[PDB]
Design a protein around this ligand. Structure first.
Ligand SMILES: CCCCCC/C=C\CCCCCCCCCC(=O)OC[C@H](COP(=O)(O)OCCN)OC(=O)CCC/C=C/CCCCCCCC
Ligand SMILES: [Fe+2]
Length: 661
């Protein structure tokens, strides 16, 4: 029953209007000069306490989010946290391109079901792009009336959101008929279509290339120096010398800091004990192997020495690097290296990428929005580093993590085991122990003289140190002493929410400036640099199934001797896994939205992030950071000229500011 006078506002307020209201209000609230709560006046203190109260209604913690139980998540994505037009157009462009490529590879009869819908999505996307360009053209022609254009930018966001919703329906329909739509490695090339194969497709079988994944691949975090081999990896002196030459020894290589180990023990349930039979993918296997790598005396390149396909040496024979002439050991070796790569996609995707970047930044985004006022300088600094993070994480949980989803198809373990393991790893990830300088130190991979070719370390420290100086300079503008740090009630509440609801292991009270600098560096590096280094290798290193796959269709090799090409081929996944792998990995590594150090809004009007003149001064803190980034960029390009293969993931021009893909 109605119509009541009190229902008068409700008649015309929609989500679109509310997005426009909020966007215009988000430029107005930026005019407020940033201040620490203790330095704000009474009026300022009251307003910020009222905003934070209303922020807690919108940004709500949950540990019961679908498909990610136990992981602190946002109950829902706020209106203002949906991706801006610029992110949506880029992402829709890649997805439409991929759908068009997939449908073109389908037999005409099977393609007939999707070709008309995909071409309509292509025309509509191009029309939406022409609207964005035309809006940008109007803004340049009349900058005074740019504020009045905001409404037409919101209408385009609604348009691209509706287009991506239609894209979502088409994907569902393609996947609903997935199994029915489905050298020996020809099926692995065929899934690409018009897309060119990555560099790995030609180099993967090479022993040096395989070892190089440990230092310049998507997972550069697990490799460690080994001083004495573990009791569960019984590689003997004679076996070592057979690979390393008659004049080398295990004891001297260990003392001369030349021995490096990959141990996948932490995979737990991501490495099932045996066969895992699934409806869509048949019988799947994944592993927790141990692998030994060594540097020669000259330390030229890292070489694979030995592989054990599991934790128990009693049930897992020792596979040793064979000679060009040892024909009878050739295939067993390719199978053992395939076991490491299977373990690698599981460890990289679920821990290094999913748990350690995405799911960590989820917690810091929520804590920032709930406890640091929009006028707080730490909020101003951190908010660009969380752009699109809540949205992309909700997508991982709802789109990638359900039963019969991409991860259920691509990763061997039962889907519940995958969710619980990825989740468990995130809860266990120590904030302080996970810092680049600390990770290098703990693993004894920090010394360039001991291990020269380690691109992630060298390029990573350049970015890490550039960020710490920026954070040190920024903190210094607002905190004149350690007293200002402890007297900050918002920062204190931010710490309390990170430890408590945030469940970030190792996080502790922030009692001073230096500590606040290290915390900020880790938060910013994790959201930007660390995410870029582990996400952007996905198209060039992970799209081709024979080079890496999170599931194998046959058990680990049972013997180093007597294996054949057919035995190794039996490990290759079914076509559906390869199909999903090429499409998801190209998508995830093709969207570069925002850039580290830019500090401008990534959506119209693209206004500066900082209004404080002390931050934005000529030669000031912000300019110095941007200039240091261009120096780091030039240093890396010089290093890549001398490297065996260019490592380009940590080039600052390729680092987005946030985790948004
Ligand atoms: C895999 C391990 C990664 C782990 C890391 C996870 C990190 C976070 C990444 C999260 C990524 C979230 C995934 C989405 C990223 C795109 C951004 C996005 O949010 O997409 C919006 C639309 C709308 O959504 P809606 O709810 O209406 O309907 C979803 C399905 N019921 O979703 C899609 O287009 C489906 C895209 C699925 C991928 C299709 C691939 C191309 C299709 C080509 C042809 C198909 C060939 C089979
Ligand atoms: Fe990512």
């Amino acid at each position: 029953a109605n119509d009541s006078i009190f229902f008068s506002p409700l008649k015309y307020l929609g989500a679109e209007q509310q997005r426009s209201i909020d966007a215009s209000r988000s430029l107005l609230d930026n005019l407020i000069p940033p201040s620490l709560p203790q330095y704000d006046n009474l009026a300022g203190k009251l307003a910020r306490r009222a905003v934070l109260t209303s922020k807690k209604l919108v940004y709500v913690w949950t540990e019961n989010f679908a498909n990610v139980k136990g992981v602190p998540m946002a109950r829902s994505v706020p209106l203002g946290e949906l991706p801006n037009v610029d992110w949506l157009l880029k992402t829709a462009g890649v997805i439409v391109e991929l759908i068009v490529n997939f449908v073109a590879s389908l037999p005409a009869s099977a393609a007939a079901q999707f070709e008309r819908i995909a071409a309509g999505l292509s025309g509509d996307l191009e029309a939406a792009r022409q609207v964005h360009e035309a809006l940008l053209e109007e803004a340049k022609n009349d900058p005074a009336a740019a504020g009045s254009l905001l409404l037409r930018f919101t209408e385009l966001q609604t348009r691209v959101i509706a287009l991506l919703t239609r894209v979502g329906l088409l994907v569902d329909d393609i996947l609903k008929s997935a199994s029915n739509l489905v050298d020996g490695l020809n099926r692995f090339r065929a899934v690409f279509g018009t897309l060119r194969l990555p560099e790995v497709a030609d180099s993967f079988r090479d022993d040096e290339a395989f070892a190089y994944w440990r230092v310049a691949g998507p997972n550069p975090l697990l490799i460690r120096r080994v001083d004495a081999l573990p009791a569960n990896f019984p590689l003997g002196e004679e076996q070592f010398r057979r690979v390393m030459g008659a004049d080398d020894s295990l004891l001297e290589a260990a003392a001369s800091r030349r021995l490096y180990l990959l141990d996948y023990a932490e995979l737990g349930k991501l490495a099932p004990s045996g066969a895992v039979d699934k409806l869509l993918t048949g019988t799947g296997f994944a592993y927790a192997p141990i692998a030994l790598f060594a540097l020669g005396k000259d330390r030229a390149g890292l070489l694979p020495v030995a592989i054990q396909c599991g934790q128990d040496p009693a049930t897992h024979p020792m596979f040793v690097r064979p000679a060009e002439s040892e024909s009878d050991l050739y295939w067993g070796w390719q199978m053992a290296k395939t076991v490491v790569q299977v373990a690698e996609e599981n460890y990289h995707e679920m821990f290094v990428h999913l748990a350690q970047t995405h799911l960590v930044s989820e917690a810091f985004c929520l804590a920032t929005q709930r406890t640091l006022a929009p006028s707080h300088p730490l909020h101003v600094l951190l908010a660009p580093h969380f752009e699109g993070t809540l949205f992309i994480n909700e997508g991982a949980a709802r789109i990638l993590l359900p039963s019969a989803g991409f991860i259920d198809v691509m990763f061997a373990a039962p889907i519940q085991d995958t969710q619980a393991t990825a989740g468990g790893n995130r809860l266990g990830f120590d904030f302080y122990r996970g810092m680049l300088p600390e990770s290098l130190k703990a693993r004894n991979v920090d010394d360039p003289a001991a291990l020269p070719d380690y691109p992630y370390r060298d390029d990573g420290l350049l970015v890490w140190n550039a960020i710490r100086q920026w954070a040190a300079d920024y903190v210094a503008v607002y905190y004149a002493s350690d007293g200002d740090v402890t007297a900050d009630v918002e920062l204190a509440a931010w710490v309390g929410e990170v430890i408590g609801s945030g469940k970030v292991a190792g996080f502790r009270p922030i009692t001073g400036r230096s500590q606040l600098v290290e915390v900020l560096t880790m938060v910013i590096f994790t959201a930007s640099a660390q995410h870029a280094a582990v996400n952007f290798p996905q198209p060039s290193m992970m799209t081709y199934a024979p080079a890496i796959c999170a599931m194998s269709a046959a058990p680990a090799p049972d013997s180093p001797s007597g294996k054949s090409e057919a035995d190794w081929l039996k490990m290759m996944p079914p076509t559906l896994v390869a199909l999903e792998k090429v499409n998801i990995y190209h998508l995830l590594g093709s969207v570069y939205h925002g850039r580290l150090g830019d500090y401008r809004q990534t959506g119209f009007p693209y206004a500066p992030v900082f209004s404080d003149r002390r931050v934005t001064a000529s030669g000031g803190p912000l300019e110095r950071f941007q200039a240091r980034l261009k120096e780091v960029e030039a240093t890396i390009r010089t290093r890549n000229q001398a490297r065996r293969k260019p490592y380009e993931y940590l080039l600052p021009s390729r680092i987005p500011a946030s985790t948004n893909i």
